[PDB]
Amino acid sequence: DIQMTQSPSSLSASVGDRVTITCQASQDITNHLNWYQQKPGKAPKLLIYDASNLETGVPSRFSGRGSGTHFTFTISSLQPADIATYYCQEYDYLPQTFGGGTKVEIK
Amino acid sequence: DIQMTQSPSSLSASVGDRVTITCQASQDITNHLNWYQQKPGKAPKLLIYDASNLETGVPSRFSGRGSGTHFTFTISSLQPADIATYYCQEYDYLPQTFGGGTKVEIK
């Protein structure tokens, strides 16, 4: 029922470029938003929980911010290992809706 | 930290075949398990929550069962629209770990 609008759909950047992805929730979800990284053919892995909290073992180049309806995920310096599709997911209410994903490629 | 072991990794069946997928949690998670369907290039969509509860609008050919550490997802009669990768995800504890996925194809 909550709708999650994630943009851009895809982007290419160079090694060391800054990447920023946004998600917009159709309802106020406070900070109940996760960010996942899904490498090709692999399962999504949780990078950031509660909008801004880094999971253990996750590199500092990854960050999240926002609260309410607007949220922003940033890769400060893109590395080869970061080529993936990234997703937000709200978990305030059923179903726990994912954003449509952002495919990150290196130019 | 919880580990989710999903099998098989991939399967092909015929239209109308029965498909069954299993997930095993490394810790007791009672019924705090979701199942998602991810079509190629799309976000995961929630089909089943709390191990066995169908989301609104989801077809009856989809079901889930289990509690504790073993869970089973079944497509009773495979249709063309069901070609997707399916995932379990535990949400009892951080990080909310996904199983490795099962790619379902039609032979």
Query: What distance lies between the first and last C-alpha atoms of chain A, to the nearest angstrom?
Result: 36 Å
> What kind of assembly state do the chains in view correspond to?
homodimer
Instruction: Name the structural class of chain A.
Output: mainly beta
E-strand count of chain A: 10
CATH superfamily (homologous) name of chain A: Immunoglobulins
Strand order of the largest sheet of chain A: 2-10-9-4-5-6
Question: What characteristics describe this protein?
Answer:
homodimer; 107 residues; mainly beta; Immunoglobulin-like; 0% helix
Task: Give the topology, please.
2 copies of one chain form a homodimer.
Chain A lengths: L3 E4 L2 E4 L5 E7 L7 E6 L6 E5 L3 E2 L7 E5 L3 E6 L8 E7 L11 E5 L1
Parallel strand pairs in A: 2-10
Antiparallel strand pairs in A: 1-3, 3-8, 4-5, 4-9, 5-6, 7-8, 9-10
Describe the structure.
Two copies of one chain form a homodimer. With 107 residues, chain A is mainly β. Chain A has a single domain, classed as Immunoglobulins (Immunoglobulin-like, Sandwich), CATH 2.60.40.10. Chain A is built from no helices and ten strands. Chain A has a six-stranded mixed sheet with strand order 2-10-9-4-5-6, with no helix packed on it. A four-stranded antiparallel sheet of chain A has the order 1-3-8-7, with no helix packed on it. The radius of gyration of chain A is 13 Å and the shape is globular. Chains A and B meet through β5 of A and β5 of B. It is classed as protein fibril.
